[PDB]
Design a protein around this ligand. Structure first.
Ligand SMILES: OC[C@H]1O[C@@H](O[C@H]2[C@H](O)[C@@H](O)[C@H](O)O[C@@H]2CO)[C@H](O)[C@@H](O)[C@H]1O
Ligand SMILES: [Ca+2]
Length: 226
């Protein structure tokens, strides 16, 4: 979808950052082969399966550079460490093995083609646009109804759709859903943005990520090109 749908909330002062939910991703019982839980590859794990795991936290105002590489001291071992400051989550968690969901809206600074590139260890699935991620100012009621991933990356796969190239309007806020899993060992998440008019890739999304309350009527985008 080259021209994803955006949204036009009625809001004077939009809330900065995305929402985040963290969930457990336990290893299998010691002695299993392989050591890691394979659930993360199930088509419905990112839709409702993660809800069968333990909720670790719901966090707000996630903004900044969300990229990280975590080097596990050893494999098949649950080890504790911390996320980058952008995640607004300061306490140690099992960086070797966890599930993370981010959602909210992306606001472009300049109208035009935007290329988002992703890489992950182990898994990063991205939905982008109204409908595809969720409905405009109707997130809660459409939360589990996201469509085909606009980008996806899975460690060890002949993966692909490591990028998404879309025409965006600076006047709209675009629903975005980012689903991450580390099954074991090293963990890594990279999201970057390249615009056609700007020479430097963007890695700090401080000014681009927003959250909005849902409304009875919704807030469909008021920019259209056909
Ligand atoms: O290499 C990244 C990759 O590691 C897997 O773990 C491997 C590890 O690479 C290897 O040194 C060890 O001997 O076996 C491990 C298999 O349990 C992770 O499973 C994978 O998620 C990546 O992080
Ligand atoms: Ca891993």
């Amino acid at each position: 979808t080259e021209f994803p749908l955006g949204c036009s909330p009625n809001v004077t002062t939009p809330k900065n950052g995305l929402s985040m939910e963290l969930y457990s991703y336990d290893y299998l019982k010691s002695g299993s082969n392989p050591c890691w839980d394979a659930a993360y590859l199930d088509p419905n794990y990112p839709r409702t399966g993660y809800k069968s795991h333990r909720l670790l936290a719901k966090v707000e105002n996630v903004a900044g550079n969300i990229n990280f590489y975590y080097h596990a001291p050893m494999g098949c071992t649950s080890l504790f460490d911390t996320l980058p400051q952008a995640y607004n989550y300061r306490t140690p968690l099992t960086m070797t093995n966890f599930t993370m969901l981010l959602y909210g809206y992306f606001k472009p600074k300049v109208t035009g083609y935007h290329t988002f590139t992703i890489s992950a260890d182990d898994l990063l699935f991205v939905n982008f646009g109204a409908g595809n991620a969720f409905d405009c100012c109707k997130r809660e009621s459409s939360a589990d109804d996201f469509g085909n991933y606009q980008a996806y990356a899975v460690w060890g796969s002949q993966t692909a759709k490591d990028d998404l190239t879309v025409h965006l309007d600076a006047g709209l806020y675009y629903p975005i859903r980012i689903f991450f899993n580390n099954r074991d060992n090293d963990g890594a998440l990279s999201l970057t943005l390249k615009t056609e008019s700007d020479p430097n890739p963007v890695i700090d999304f401080s000014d681009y990520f927003y959250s909005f309350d849902d409304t009875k009527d919704g807030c469909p985008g008021l920019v259209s090109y056909d």
